[PDB]
């Protein structure tokens, strides 16, 4: 499989990615309700580009993107997330020269909503 | 071995699955009593499907469903384990490029009954 | 070495066991005296059968039984743990593909003794 | 890809860098805003040159320097991070035996702007 | 290099074993002073054997005993670590399939004195 | 790279050796101020001698020394870390069988002042 990032029309090489959901729950189940969600974080493949800095540096900034899940043989699209309106809220760029892909950025935005198959959370 | 989850007619490949009970016990021994039970945490291949998304973004929703243990060699169903009236409480999908199966769902139902072989508990 | 777990007439192959007791001590040395035993982890081979699971659902009920050690080469029973009188306190199935003994049981009894070659200790 | 460090016209050969900037969010999303940045980790062969183990000895000393990425097969300095009036904060030289660059320093310093590809934080 | 533990004339092939004295210190340097001492931890092999397990059991039964290092070619007693009237404090008997000397016993004495080479630490 | 340590005469072959200085910051950089300095972690294949047993039960007892770093192809002491009135703190000898150098001591000094290239940091 492979993934990529798209925002402000730059494409990102993505090397993780993930989004959680959740509500508390009383005692055993009973759901306290209430949920958090929109908080997605990526870690990407550094390259000459420095937007993403720019990005955190921005701060108030939000942005609109997608990030879309590719069929490892095949070229179409298995899935596409998307967010509206996220905001930069932590980034962090390290260099490992112990490994594989050394430079790397990893960042969390924070979005209004997500969205993906007819599924929707908004805050 | 090899098992599945089954929702909605829908069936899961699982890599993972866990679903654990306890009750407290006082000083040494002396169980504290009273139990918690009747949640499941899974893992599943992601696939193109959302549905999983979709239920985490429902809520309230609760639902049926059983996960299927088969023996490795043999088509037929060493234990299956059954859960009723289960809601969607955290959920996470993750991407991975670094091993194996990347791109994964891992969530935590909360049911009202689990049952197996004749063994119950409800809450 | 290889070991297994007898209770109500049923044979467990046991991946793991453990069984601990302690005392505290006050600044150095200077046992504070009073002392926890019986409590015991094991970790099982799940197979077709749902007996375990029962017994953490049936809460109350307590057993006896006993951990028998045999030696790798050898059939004679290097040494035996017996527990009297012990209540399911924890319980959890978990399958992970990943490897090995993919489907295990992992639960937790608390007896009211537990004796080994003349050694006893007792609630 | 290969880095290097740039302080008082020496040069050191970097294995790990890492900067990192956050703001806190409130509730979900609901960025409580106020940013933290500056703060930038590095890893050093030891070399037989104490230079920065005299930084932090000196301790109110501040500085200027750049880290730069270089593109792995070719010389021409891909990004460049540009840190202004820098203060040691944290230093520790270690040897280890067990492994590779056995004799490194880890440092941290704490800088009043970083700045690269035209984005900036100053505090 | 391989040990063993003599204990009431009985010797234990020893896997582990480790002894620590500390003293807290004030501000930078600056030792609060008061120590603590005389505390030995060691892993065994099981053997058919139970008589650690009935120390524990004892509980009060201070003794004697010494833990001797010999170098790994020559019988010789490279060193030797000698206490007196320690007492069962922890006991763990684990059995862990998964590899090497799957049947271990990990203890922990409190010796009233630790003494080797000439150096002393009594309670 | 190979390095030793020098106490009372007597050489130690050195596995790892570790010492770091640090001052905090209020808020982001804006150096707190104070500094803390002087501590020195150290391992040692333990030999037959029984030394720095002794010292450690000793307690008050200061003492001077350096710690030699040698580069690796040659002989000519690279960096020499020179520390004096080291007050022993805490101390541990380790034996595993598991791996490498089984027997070693472990153990940390708390000096008066370190000293290396001309730099200096006193309490």
Redesign the interface.
Known sequence: ???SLTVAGKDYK??????????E?DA????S?V?????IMIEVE??????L??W??N??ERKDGSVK?I?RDSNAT??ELKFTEA?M??????????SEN??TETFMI???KIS??????D?
Not at 28 to 31: K, T
Not at 35 to 39: D, S
Not at 116 to 121: I, L, T, V
Request: charged letters at 20%; glycine letters at 12%; hydrophobic letters at 30%.
């Open positions: 499989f492979l993934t993505v090397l993780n990615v993930s989004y959680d959901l959740a509500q729950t055993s189940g009973r759901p309700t949920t958090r969600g929109g908080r550094s390259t000459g580009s420095t937007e800095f720019e955190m540096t701060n108030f899940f069929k298995l899935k905001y809220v932590k980034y962090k760029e390290n260099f490992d020269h112990n050394p430079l924070s979005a209004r993906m198959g007819g599924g929707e959370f805050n």
